[PDB]
Amino acid sequence: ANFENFIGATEGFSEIAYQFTSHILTLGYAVMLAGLLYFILTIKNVDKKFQMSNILSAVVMVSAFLLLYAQAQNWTSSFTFNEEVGRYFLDPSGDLFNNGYRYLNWLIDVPMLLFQILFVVSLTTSKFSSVRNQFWFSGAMMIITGYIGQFYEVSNLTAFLVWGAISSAFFFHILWVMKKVINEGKEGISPAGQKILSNIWILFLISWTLYPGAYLMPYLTGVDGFLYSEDGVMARQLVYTIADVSSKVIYGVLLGNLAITLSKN
Ligand SMILES: *C\C=C(C)/C=C/C=C(C)/C=C/C1=C(C)CCCC1(C)C
């Protein structure tokens, strides 16, 4: 199937690759539940006019909590310890590790995260429905072609890369539209608000680039290097979790800070 199962069937997992990776994925859904509460309780602090951004954050938190909970559980129960050999191995009496929970969660989140900035900032010369449509279309293709090529991770590498590139194309379109949004949204807001918009742009830039980095990570040091081990598994799932916290939680915190700042009139 995927590179995690491959390693879990050929080599196996040490006790600290398995446990660390169970612990990092558990932290990841724990944060989403703490986010959920943060976004509900804070709705009171922003004018009715920006509150839709909180609403959307809350819904993203709900979706990610549940699906990343499934992903966590799909990791713990996929491997079992062989006390003879001392490593954790893929369990044939199991469901086998599956990235589908995470990809599904991106597909749901991607329109809400992109749409929500458009309730905090104003466009100038661009049309609202035009930005929305471009966002929703290319965000969905990006995740789907990201998902297709992920089935060929271990089997066919050339496909894994060509599909991953097809998914980069859509990714970069999104970065174009977002940069445009952020420029127009800077016009006629305060210097404080403009500061926060610039922070949002950099956080959105780093955090979303982590994801194709995590896609490639097992092959980053070549088809026989350091990362082509259970360490690319640890690194891949550490990067995904950082990217989930940054693109979903931190992003919407910054947007809520931008909204409050915009109630200074
Ligand atoms: C959790 C919320 C969101 C919006 C997740 C976004 C994920 C990405 C931007 C993933 C992008 C990919 C790219 C650019 C190319 C390889 C395949 C990926 C799906 C990992």
Nearest in space to 70 (alpha carbons), one of 110, 13, 112, 32: 32
- Distance between CA atoms of 219 and 137, rounded to whole angstroms? 29
- CA dist 54 to 51, 61, 191, 220, Å? 5, 10, 23, 37
Closest-CA residue to 96 (of 165, 1, 185): 1
Protein residue with its CA nearest to atom 6 in ligand 1: 106
- Which is nearest to 218 in space by CA: 238, 203, 204? 238
114: Cβ contacts below 8 Å, ≥ 6 apart: 135, 136, 139, 174, 178
Task: Write a three-state SS string for 108-142.
Answer: HHHHHHHHHHHHCCCCCCCCHHHHHHHHHHHHHHH
- Kindly compute the dihedral angle of the four CA atoms of residues 136, 142, 145, 149, in this order, to the nearest 10 degrees: -160
Both tokens assigned to 215: 């896609």
47 burial type by CB count under 10 A (0-12 exposed, 13-18 middle, 19+ buried): exposed
Residue with tokens 């990343």: 68
Domain count, the chain: 1
Which long-range CB contacts under 8 A does 123-129 form with residues at least 24 apart? Answer: 123/181, 123/184, 123/185, 124/184, 124/187, 125/184, 126/180, 126/181, 126/184
* Cβ 254 under 6 angstroms from ligand 1: no
Are β-strands 88-90 and 79-81 bridged in parallel, bridged antiparallel, or unpaired? Answer: antiparallel
Structural domain harbouring 248: 1-265
Question: How many CB atoms are located within 10 Å of the residue 186 CB?
Answer: 17
CATH number of the structural domain spanning residue 218: 1.20.1070.10
Instruction: Kindly state if the Cβ of 101 falls inside 6 Å of ligand 1.
Output: no
| Atom 12, ligand 1: residue with shortest CA distance | 212
Q: What is the resolution of this structure in A?
A: 2.2
- C-alpha 211/C-alpha 164 separation (Å) is 11
Question: Strands, DSSP E only, in the chain?
Answer: 79-81, 88-90
Separation of alpha carbons 62 and 65, rounded Å: 5
CA nearest 74: which of 49, 46, 98? 98
Query: Which residues 6+ apart lie within 8 Å of 146 measured at CB?
Result: 103, 106, 163, 164, 167, 215
User: How many angstroms does the Cα of residue 97 sit away from the middle of ligand 1?
Assistant: 19
**Which two structure tokens, joined as six digits, stand for 58?**
């809350």
Q: How was this structure determined?
A: X-ray
